[PDB]
Paper text:
With the exception of the M. thermoresistibile target which did not contain NAD, all other mycobacterial SDR target crystal structures contained NAD, which appears to have co-purified with the protein after expression in E. coli. For each of these crystal structures, the adenosine mononucleotide portion of the cofactor binding site is enveloped by the inserted residues and only a portion of the nicotinamide ring appears open to solvent (see representative examples in Fig. 2A and B). Only a small portion of the nicotinamide ring appears available to solvent in each of these cases, indicating that the NAD cofactor is tightly bound and potentially non-exchangeable. The structures presented here have a cofactor solvent accessible surface area of approximately 18 Å2, whereas other NAD- or NADP-bound dehydrogenases have a cofactor solvent accessible surface area of 82–89 Å2. Alternatively, these structural elements may not allow for exchange of bound NAD/NADH with free NAD/NADH.
Here we present a series of TIGR03971 SDR crystal structures from several mycobacterial species which contain an insertion in the primary sequence at the NAD cofactor binding site. These crystal structures demonstrate that the inserted protein residues almost completely cover the NAD cofactor, only leaving part of the nicotinamide ring exposed to solvent. NMR experiments did not show exchange of the NAD cofactor, whereas binding was demonstrated for a number of small molecules which could be potential substrates, products, inhibitors, or artificial redox partners.
Numbering used by the authors:
A (entry chain A), B (entry chain C), C (entry chain B), D (entry chain D): 7 to 276
Write the structure that this text describes.
């Protein structure tokens, strides 16, 4: 496979896109270090939470590919827990080639109506939590000496801010900037850093209830959420997003660092 | 008198660019609500801090333009302080036409070498603090019913992330997103929201030794910091930045909302 | 006035936006060199053409501002005619401070359905014609030695390409590039170069029959043409576009070169 | 292989990037239609031209992959030649799945110093010739009814214009626009359209002598041409660009349409 004998570290791997990346990267030959908070993060995040069962199942799916999975329940806002998982992973697998910084949360409210808890939770998990993930993994990837590839999961909202979630758009634009700063800073080490910007991926993060409420109260907001030109009905799958991550993780994308890749089937073109 | 009889609320107004905006908007006719921490923000911010004398100085300069100045020492991370200043300001002036969210801080370190204090300070002042400023002022502007103009001070690093300051670049990209989400959400209220992206402005924030050290350690980082094509030697002034803020604040820029204006004499073109 | 004693050269000045710039820059104190083809460009351009009477009217409006107008019927694709008008303008006024490259045409068709005529006309007037305008005017501005400001009229379709007019979108993206290349090349001469990107300006170019037909045949294209957030009904006026041009033309925008200014009341945010 | 039983049409296939794409897509299992002017395009293009022999070598390299090659000497500016090659191609192969519009030329000069020959050659080949290529191929792809993937070769200068070649930067920005217009127009047909933006690729197009002449006269222009952060010395190869084209051509990129992919090893981040 394109990743035979390599090792990837993936956050938010309990379900959804994170699980898809873990399984796909395993299918490509990588052993997997995977973590997820496996719990509701906040009263302000109103869709269904991931469970520890979900993470165990990612691990079974990785093992089904003939690979090894080290999994752990942790919060990416918990620096000590991240350091320890990285250390345990390096002891078990001995190298670190791919990082997928994927854990995130979403909530909704107009900028001046957002609460402290809404703000702090989204900025804290999405932006600070990603930074902590990067700070914990980068030294191990440098020390391993094999170069590497880091994929930061931003959002289409990380390139074009959307109404009703300025805190989420801010967190995700912040991720675009981290990706690009880190691409410059890690160039000399042979480590590439790129970001993906998905749209309309069918996971529990998309709460149809929340969207209907937003468009009910502010009908003009619909103009920020158009159909996808090459798939004008319904949603893309988490596995489809994993096609992009697999390619970025491997040598086929050796010419890309600092790129913002929209995974949106054309929606950002409208 | 492009702003005759109007009221502007400005953060970080003790000195530097914030001072220049206060005095200019005053000379255009606006009375001024202005605030600043007037103290060191963090050991991690190594250049000289502003003083309470600086903010009194801004107040006197505004008064010399024939206008009123309400000033206060507060931290933009202190929500109650912000709310109280907005309330006292509305009591005194009865309207709010312009917000210039200008308070900010800078420090330097590669992404994986940043400390919790460096990160938390930059994200908390620049991103969260700006959000708190917007949340505290937007409802007064809506209630006044005269529409208005909000200027968010981002940076050239909020459009093109730079090496050695990923936290700062993230904070300022986050501000780009806040500007654009807010522009959409406030359009129906007749309030325009735009961001400026300065480069090389002569204020204490760019005392040169930090940058000298960064380049000495990481020589390749110089490529991210080119000359300004229309001023290839030296620095732009804080009063030059206030020309742009003055035009965005007033009606001459009525066709602009959601725009990112580089104030860089062309440096972003390189 | 902000442009007192200065001289501006404006193309497509017979009506619409170009007329509004001519009259506005005259009100600011500038003398005006104004030109327009005053004729239908092509059978492929289906809205009403400008007439010589239109250009004489622009001249009368300039003269009512107390300023002088040199006007000339010419085609921006005609190099000799451009060179001759620049020369006559320098003989009359002895200087050249502002250039507004505004002449433009529009037609509609899907990429693979466009005719040679449709393509050649739009590329030829918009992209090549603007280039000829800059080549003919830039040497005179340099020679005069007072620095200057050049405004290139692109479109929102010069930043975000639209369906049904790939030729026009390509021409206007070409103008964004020309603006930026020229800004770098002219920096050393003290000449600023910026582009404006309007949307939904009420001129004959936007007679609604063509757009109505495009939408009826290709209904999904409607997603590319959202409302303006701060003006969700109707169109902006040519005089409103002239507010931005006037500011760019003068010293208040001395910190801007190489900037792309959307004049769209927020529409590109959606 | 990923493109087994499919057909790809490639322009500029005599050598350099175009040859790399033809041989790679053949290795993935596609039969090839390939064409090239195999002659000097213009006195204004000063580096060595491709030869008919170059194109025959490409054909052999395709046949070595065990695939069929239909090749033809033609100018992409020549519409009848394109239609006839497309027609012969469909008769021979029966379908058309991938188009790589790669033919291009480069020359150098400041905007107001460019000759008519310089301008007309670069716009005619790069912008108009690419348009003609798309207009000739898109109908055949639609009629075949299998969807498809179209790759437009722009340049880093199609994202960030460069000094000394405003005409080339304009032509390549125009290609960005064509890509995105076409992505919206072709979505309903299951045809994806994406653009690549390479930098520093080792082909005859990079003439060390012309660069040295440019920097000799205008030293400040060097700031637009930085090193590649993940390959700070030397050039990337044509085969490395072909990794990106092979991925875009195939189903692994099914989530991408309207994307601008920089192929620059990070250079655009500086
Ligand atoms: N669903 C979409 O349409 C969409 C679009 C663009 C971007 N995104 C982003 O994609 C990424 C994956 O989201 P998803 O769609 O699979 O949704 P999801 O909610 O199903 O998956 C996110 C996972 O992250 C975990 N997580 C949340 N906070 C965490 C924390 N503090 N520490 C550790 N783990 C945490 C969750 O438990 C969950 O398992 C997220 O970053 C999200 O913002 C989603
Ligand atoms: N100087 C530059 O080159 C440059 C370039 C681009 C952007 N910026 C941005 O411009 C803005 C103004 O900075 P400047 O150049 O005038 O530097 P400065 O340090 O001279 O001024 C910033 C002011 O903000 C105040 N401030 C900092 N943290 C605060 C807090 N928590 N609460 C209240 N006040 C606080 C400071 O006391 C100071 O008076 C900042 O947002 C900065 O990030 C500066
Ligand atoms: N109307 C809009 O909504 C809109 C939006 C974005 C950009 N634009 C651009 O604004 C600019 C001004 O257009 P407008 O809206 O005022 O439309 P308009 O057609 O009323 O004005 C354009 C003027 O350019 C002149 N012209 C056309 N081809 C010429 C040529 N070859 N040589 C000399 N003159 C020529 C015309 O005769 C006409 O007077 C154009 O470049 C157009 O592409 C318009
Ligand atoms: N080399 C670089 O660094 C670089 C960087 C960015 C983009 N590009 C672009 O990549 C593409 C490939 O260029 P390359 O680097 O392989 O250079 P190249 O000159 O080796 O290849 C270009 C090929 O296109 C052919 N061609 C030129 N004009 C033609 C016409 N009118 N009709 C048919 N064929 C024609 C040439 O004969 C040549 O074989 C071009 O579009 C170029 O602009 C190159």
């Amino acid at each position: 496979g394109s990743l035979q004998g390599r090792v990837a570290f993936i956050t938010g791997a309990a379900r959804g896109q994170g699980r898809s990346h873990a399984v796909r990267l395993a299918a490509e030959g990588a052993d997997i270090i995977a973590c997820d908070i496996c719990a509701p993060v906040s009263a302000s995040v109103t869709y269904a939470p991931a469970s520890p069962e979900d993470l165990d199942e990612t691990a079974r799916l990785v093992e089904d590919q003939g690979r090894k999975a080290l999994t752990r329940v942790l919060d990416v806002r918990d620096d000590a827990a991240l350091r320890e998982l990285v250390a345990d992973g390096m002891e078990q697998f001995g190298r670190l080639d791919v990082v997928v910084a994927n854990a995130g949360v979403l909530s909704w409210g107009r900028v001046w109506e957002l609460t402290d808890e809404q703000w702090d939770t989204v900025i804290g998990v999405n932006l600070t939590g990603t930074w902590r993930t990067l700070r914990a993994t980068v030294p191990a990837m440098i020390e391993a000496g094999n170069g590497g590839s880091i994929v930061v999961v931003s959002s289409s909202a990380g390139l074009k801010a959307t109404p009703g979630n300025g805190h989420y758009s801010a967190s995700k634009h912040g991720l675009t900037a981290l990706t690009n700063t880190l691409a410059i800073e890690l160039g000399e080490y042979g480590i590439r850093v790129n970001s993906i910007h998905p749209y309309s991926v069918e996971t529990p993060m998309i709460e149809p209830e929340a969207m209907m409420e937003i468009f009910a109260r502010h009908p003009s907001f619909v103009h920020s959420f158009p159909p996808m030109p090459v798939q004008p009905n319904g949603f893309m799958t988490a596995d489809e997003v994993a096609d992009v991550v697999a390619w970025l993780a491997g040598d086929g994308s050796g010419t890309l660092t600092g790129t913002q890749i929209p995974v949106d089937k054309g929606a950002l073109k409208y």
